[PDB]
Amino acid sequence: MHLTPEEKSAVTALWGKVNVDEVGGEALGRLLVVYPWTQRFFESFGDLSTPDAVMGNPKVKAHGKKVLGAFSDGLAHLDNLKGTFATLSELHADKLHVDPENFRLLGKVLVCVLAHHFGKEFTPPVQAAYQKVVAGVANALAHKYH
Amino acid sequence: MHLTPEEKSAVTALWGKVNVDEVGGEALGRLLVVYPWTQRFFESFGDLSTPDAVMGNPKVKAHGKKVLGAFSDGLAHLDNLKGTFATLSELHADKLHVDPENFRLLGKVLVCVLAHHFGKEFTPPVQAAYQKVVAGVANALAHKYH
Amino acid sequence: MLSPADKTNVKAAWGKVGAHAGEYGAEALERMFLSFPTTKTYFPHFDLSHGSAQVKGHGKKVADALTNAVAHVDDMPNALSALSDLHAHKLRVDPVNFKLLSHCLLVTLAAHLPAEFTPAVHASLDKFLASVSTVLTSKYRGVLSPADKTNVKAAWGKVGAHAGEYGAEALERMFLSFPTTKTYFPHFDLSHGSAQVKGHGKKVADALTNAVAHVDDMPNALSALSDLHAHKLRVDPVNFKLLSHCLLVTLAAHLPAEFTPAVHASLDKFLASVSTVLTSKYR
Numbered sequence A, B: 001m002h003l004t005p006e007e008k009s010a011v012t013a014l015w016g017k018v019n020v021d022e023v024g025g026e027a028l029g030r031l032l033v034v035y036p037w038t039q040r041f042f043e044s045f046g047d048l049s050t051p052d053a054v055m056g057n058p059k060v061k062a063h064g065k066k067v068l069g070a071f072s073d074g075l076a077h078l079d080n081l082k083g084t085f086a087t088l089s090e091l092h093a094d095k096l097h098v099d100p101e102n103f104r105l106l107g108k109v110l111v112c113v114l115a116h117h118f119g120k121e122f123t124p125p126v127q128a129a130y131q132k133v134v135a136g137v138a139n140a141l142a143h144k145y146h
Numbered sequence C: 001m002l003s004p005a006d007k008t009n010v011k012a013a014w015g016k017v018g019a020h021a022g023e024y025g026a027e028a029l030e031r032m033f034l035s036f037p038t039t040k041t042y043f044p045h046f047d048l049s050h051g052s053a054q055v056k057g058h059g060k061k062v063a064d065a066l067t068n069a070v071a072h073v074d075d076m077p078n079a080l081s082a083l084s085d086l087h088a089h090k091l092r093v094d095p096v097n098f099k100l101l102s103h104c105l106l107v108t109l110a111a112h113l114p115a116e117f118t119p120a121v122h123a124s125l126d127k128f129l130a131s132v133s134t135v136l137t138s139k140y141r142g143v144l145s146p147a148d149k150t151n152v153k154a155a156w157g158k159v160g161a162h163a164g165e166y167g168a169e170a171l172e173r174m175f176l177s178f179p180t181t182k183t184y185f186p187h188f189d190l191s192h193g194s195a196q197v198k199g200h201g202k203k204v205a206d207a208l209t210n211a212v213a214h215v216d217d218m219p220n221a222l223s224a225l226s227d228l229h230a231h232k233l234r235v236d237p238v239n240f241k242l243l244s245h246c247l248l249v250t251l252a253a254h255l256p257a258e259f260t261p262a263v264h265a266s267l268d269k270f271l272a273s274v275s276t277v278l279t280s281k282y283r
């Protein structure tokens, strides 16, 4: 995907400060709290009954770390999101059967978490750049669904 | 946009039976009835007060003929919708200020009209082909919105 | 809401469907599976081959419940209460997909009802399927709970005097992140620091302040605004989701301590409720 120079710079500069483990646990956990129907994929994760249980759930933390780790790897290949995510796209479509709309919900929550964590530094132009990136990653993950 | 040969064939085969002016007037008229907020662009067209007045409104008909004529011409360039509709995209974005969501609503109404007009000949596979095409046209018209 | 003219139209169309309801329901699913293949992720446990007994069986159950909704059009939440619970708590189908099946049900009816599917009946059927989808998804998160109201009132109180500033930031975020929304303000200077943007953000924020102060009586309190968006401005309903998102992003960026997961959830629910009221009179 193509971004302006200023947009790419905005995205990579901020991501250098992101501790993927911490933000990853937080983004997945909020997804499960704010849009609880997304819990349908994580029945084996344990207690997800309340916000505090979700946020302290070590399996939630570890999965978020895994998910955003892969996302992170995607940012290093902004020029070819489809090719980078094709295998994981197949995985999600054919084995996990995850409705790609979940990728978009996760995108929305992720933007909220970056704003929460970084505050004033997450300016309107930086958000716009990230919105393009999370949309492009969701589209890349949805590509192999047939 | 990518369709299979058989999808391309099925779309072009049915379109050969379309009276573009009639279906155009019908599809734009139904858009204005079913999703009345779309009337916002057409206050210079006169009486839009009842479904029968919308459907019988000569300016509505004329606009539908224009719109679906452009769509029609678009079907001859299924391999290059983006390029085919680029100037029209800029026009709707910069001068007409039409929210591209309207193109998606028109695509939904057009699918319904084709089913109504053609009945059983509008089979589930024929619909799937048209759904890709109307989404394809919407994305192409939304492309220059910046 | 469905007018009595809508209910008459729906009852006429569905009466005509009559005994084919099951068959039409199965056709709608097949059309859905073909046209929107992401919907198949909810049925990995089915044989989705054309004419499969599972698809036929589910088609008839879908149609039964619609017949039930038609026969209890004035009492829909009550009548579909068990179905609501099941989708909210068990199946947990993302609400986006209800729109896709409704569209395919509409295409199916059009293809089988040439005489009855007039423009006004089309509009009524569309409204009815949207109402059904609303009821079936109403317990996913439910109405605002007393914890939600408390959470919203605390977060907004903390916002206090900066409500106007935050509203302008949210608009700026919205214009930059979702450029299609700019088509509603061709008459504005949308540059950064624009006073038109600041003045409008203050109006938006003041209306939200009004809503928080009337959380239990929101439709009346927002009635003039509902009128204005429905009949004058005529903003496509999709756009309310985008501003809500940017309002949430704005609050997150300014409320480091207060924007907890629980408060985030309550705020998201609150803004969806506000958006629901503001679009309630469109149709």
Ligand code: HEM
Pocket: A038, A041, A042, A063, A066, A067, A068, A070, A071, A088, A092, A096, A098, A102, A103, A106, A137, A141
């Ligand atoms: C940016 C979006 C996403 C990325 C990059 C991503 C990436 C991944 C990766 C790397 C795995 C691990 C595979 C393995 O270890 O073999 C995985 C598995 C999984 N993902 Fe995704 N994911 C994303 C979004 C989602 C969302 C939103 C959901 C559902 C709400 C989801 C549901 C799952 C499930 C259920 C698993 C398997 C967990 C288990 O093994 O118990 N993913 N994902």
Ligand code: HEM
Pocket: B038, B041, B066, B067, B068, B070, B071, B088, B092, B096, B098, B102, B103, B106, B137, B138, B141
């Ligand atoms: C696939 C969808 C569409 C296509 C192909 C299309 C195409 C066109 C064309 C060919 C023109 C004339 C431009 C010229 O004469 O240079 C036009 C104008 C216009 N369109 Fe679109 N259009 C579409 C959808 C829409 C929708 C959904 C709306 C609004 C609900 C809309 C609103 C307008 C308006 C307001 C005008 C100008 C009317 C006039 O000046 O007489 N268009 N469109």
Ligand code: HEM
Pocket: C039, C042, C043, C058, C061, C062, C065, C066, C083, C086, C087, C091, C093, C097, C098, C101, C102, C132, C133, C136
């Ligand atoms: C017009 C909206 C809908 C209605 C009226 C409806 C109604 C129903 C009914 C009557 C049942 C069976 C209840 C029972 O057996 O106790 C059911 C089950 C189910 N629904 Fe919904 N449904 C709707 C939309 C959807 C959508 C859009 C999806 C997903 C794409 C969906 C996914 C499912 C699934 C997966 C089942 C379970 C199938 C099984 O295991 O037998 N529903 N629905």
Ligand code: HEM
Pocket: C181, C184, C185, C200, C203, C204, C207, C208, C225, C228, C229, C233, C235, C239, C240, C243, C244, C274, C275, C278
């Ligand atoms: C959270 C939802 C919203 C609220 C509470 C809200 C509230 C308001 C208020 C208070 C006004 C001014 C009324 C007056 O002049 O008396 C207004 C006007 C307006 N709104 Fe909404 N609004 C919302 C969302 C939106 C969205 C999403 C759009 C379109 C993208 C929009 C477009 C407009 C426009 C174009 C005006 C008129 C501005 C002017 O010409 O001065 N609104 N809104």
